[PDB]
Amino acid sequence: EVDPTHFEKRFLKRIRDLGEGHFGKVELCRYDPEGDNTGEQVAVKSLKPGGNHIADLKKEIEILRNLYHENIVKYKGICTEDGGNGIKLIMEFLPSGSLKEYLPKNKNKINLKQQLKYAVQICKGMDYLGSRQYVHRDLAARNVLVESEHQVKIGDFGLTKAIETDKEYYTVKDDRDSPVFWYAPECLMQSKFYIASDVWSFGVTLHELLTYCDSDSSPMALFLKMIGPTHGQMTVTRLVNTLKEGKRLPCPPNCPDEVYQLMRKCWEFQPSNRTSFQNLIEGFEALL
Numbered sequence: 001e002v003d004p005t006h007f008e009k010r011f012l013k014r015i016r017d018l019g020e021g022h023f024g025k026v027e028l029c030r031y032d033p034e035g036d037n038t039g040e041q042v043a044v045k046s047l048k049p050g051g052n053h054i055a056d057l058k059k060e061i062e063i064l065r066n067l068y069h070e071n072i073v074k075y076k077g078i079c080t081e082d083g084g085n086g087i088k089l090i091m092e093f094l095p096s097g098s099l100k101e102y103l104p105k106n107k108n109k110i111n112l113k114q115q116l117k118y119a120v121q122i123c124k125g126m127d128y129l130g131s132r133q134y135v136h137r138d139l140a141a142r143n144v145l146v147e148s149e150h151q152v153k154i155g156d157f158g159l160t161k162a163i164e165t166d167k168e169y170y171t172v173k174d175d176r177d178s179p180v181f182w183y184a185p186e187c188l189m190q191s192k193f194y195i196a197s198d199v200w201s202f203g204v205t206l207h208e209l210l211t212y213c214d215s216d217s218s219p220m221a222l223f224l225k226m227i228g229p230t231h232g233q234m235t236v237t238r239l240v241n242t243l244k245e246g247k248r249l250p251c252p253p254n255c256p257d258e259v260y261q262l263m264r265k266c267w268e269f270q271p272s273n274r275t276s277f278q279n280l281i282e283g284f285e286a287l288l
């Protein structure tokens with residue numbers, strides 16, 4: 001009898017691209033064994049043509065296989081290489097896509113109440129992750145998927161890493177294409193990643209969410225307005241120095257102050273003096 005978490009390459013047919021990075025990409029595929037365009041749609045993550053990167057995909061697969069939560073995207077299966085070494089990650093396709101693509105088109109349908117509900121839902125997926133001894137390192141609006149207008153999910157686990165029991169953080173080596181405008185100062189300075197660093201990133205993600213992922217008011221474009229548009233190599237050190245001074249992203253327009261103070265609490269300098277995902281749920285719930 002057949003394994004349902006096993007997708008043969010021959011039946012996996014590409015439709016379009018959904019996203020890519022400097023290492024791997026995610027496509028839309030129909031798994032169509034019958035060969036009649038009736039099969040189920042899926043998100044297929046794979047590597048671009050990388051010895052060190054096949055290791056990373058296997059880890060990601062094995063992390064995502066064992067996460068079971070309403071607000072985390074669902075592992076469907078794997079597709080193996082015919083020789084052995086290569087591999088693909090098969091996930092559920094959510095056709096409304098990331099918040100980045102969704103919010104600009106559905107501003108009429110989505111109001112402050114609904115944005116705060118998404119926010120709660122992101123904190124619940126993130127607290128499940130954290131409690132399973134994992135640090136995400138990549139929480140942006142672009143990795144939050146829309147299941148429906150009442151449901152979002154964390155849809156990417158590319159940079160997700162185990163924190164050891166003894167240690168209280170993870171130290172990264174390959175920081176080369178990091179999302180710097182989403183990062184806490186310890187990530188920028190010591191290359192260190194605490195659960196509290198994911199909370200930093202949530203605050204920025206929450207900023208994007210509250211501005212309907214308008215490019216013109218995005219974390220990059222507002223940080224680059226503050227520090228300087230054209231500093232090249234010195235961008236990241238100049239970012240670290242404005243955060244040291246106490247400069248943070250401004251209140252989104254039509255965001256009430258009480259929401260903004262929950263956002264501000266995400267962005268305290270020291271990881272230990274920073275709010276928790278549980279505390280954030282209770283603050284959002286009280287507003288709703």
Ligand SMILES: Cc1[nH]nc2[nH]c(=O)cc([C@H]3CC[C@H](NC(=O)[C@@H]4CC4(F)F)CC3)c12
Binds near residue numbers: 018024158
């Ligand atoms: C997983 C998934 N299920 N359903 C989807 N519907 C969508 O519209 C888009 C996506 C993903 C969202 C995350 C993106 N992640 C990357 O680009 C990272 C750099 C990389 F590794 F490619 C990929 C596309 C969907």
